[PDB]
Design a binder for these strands. Structure first.
Lengths: 149, 147
DNA sequence: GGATAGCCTATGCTACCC
DNA sequence: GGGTAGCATAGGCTATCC
């Protein structure tokens, strides 16, 4: 029985469906309690949200969800994390060595909404079963902003 | 002519090309012997590098790894679009461009600043596309728990 | 809503060209 | 040291499973 190959939707062209819509609605409810400004007139991307861990699929679905809930943001594809510190006095891994742990980046126009978005993702995720509850989120601040093309 | 050389993702070593870029960086980083590590060892800061071209970004990445053993670096990935100009609707948050980026993780913000300065100065005397590479210092409120 | 199959195509990697 | 070729294997995407 089926199970897909090519569906004519390229990188970044993801549509919607109940699964991603339901995730988005979870975010929207939380976000609606904090009705803060998500845009500025200048429109620069001065803040971000760095999301990682859990599992590839759970991260992916979260990314798809955020996208539907927040048209005012911009989101990278999933990518991978390098390793952290090795314990003890020994040698460390090279800076390029990559792990199995994924991450994605959300860009935002206001610092205020970045904080709220971060809170919402945490709360959305903290009550769900593993691996989704293990998804970590941190606000990310850009000194000079980012010139998204 | 190359195909498979046995080197998987993240395993890249060194050669004259990358070491040359690394030495350029080392000289510049030597302008400011600030602390690059903490006792706690948390990844609280970074630099966000993007633009130029795929290859010039890539080569920079390789060079930084050789010049800065104390950092950790993502693979290259892609940027989503910004604001669309004028009358049209905005692109979806997921739509991706051709512009690449990578992230460097650091344990101190003070060195992030120096690393950024180093990259800008390293790149501004070069021709396009490399001179068009953009850098910003990056700060993680709650840090990043790199595996 | 997480995990997977399976086409498309992205990057990581190296050595070659110049 | 920028652009490339070309294997390996990342992810984006979907429907199907359950």
């Amino acid at each position: 029985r089926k199970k897909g190959g090519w569906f004519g939707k390229h990188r970044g062209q993801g549509g919607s469906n109940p699964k991603f819509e339901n995730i988005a609605e979870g975010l929207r409810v939380l976000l609606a309690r904090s009705h803060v400004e998500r845009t500025t007139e200048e429109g620069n991307w001065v803040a971000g949200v760095f999301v990682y861990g859990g599992s590839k699929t759970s991260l992916y679905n979260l990314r798809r969800g955020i996208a539907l809930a927040v048209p005012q943001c911009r989101i990278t594809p999933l990518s991978r994390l390098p390793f952290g510190m090795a314990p003890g006095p020994g040698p460390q891994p090279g800076p390029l060595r990559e792990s199995i742990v994924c991450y994605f980046m959300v860009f935002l126009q206001t610092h205020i909404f970045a904080e709220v978005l971060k809170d919402a993702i945490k709360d959305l995720v903290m009550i769900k079963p593993a691996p989704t509850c293990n998804i970590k989120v941190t606000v990310c601040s850009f000194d000079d902003g980012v010139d998204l093309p």
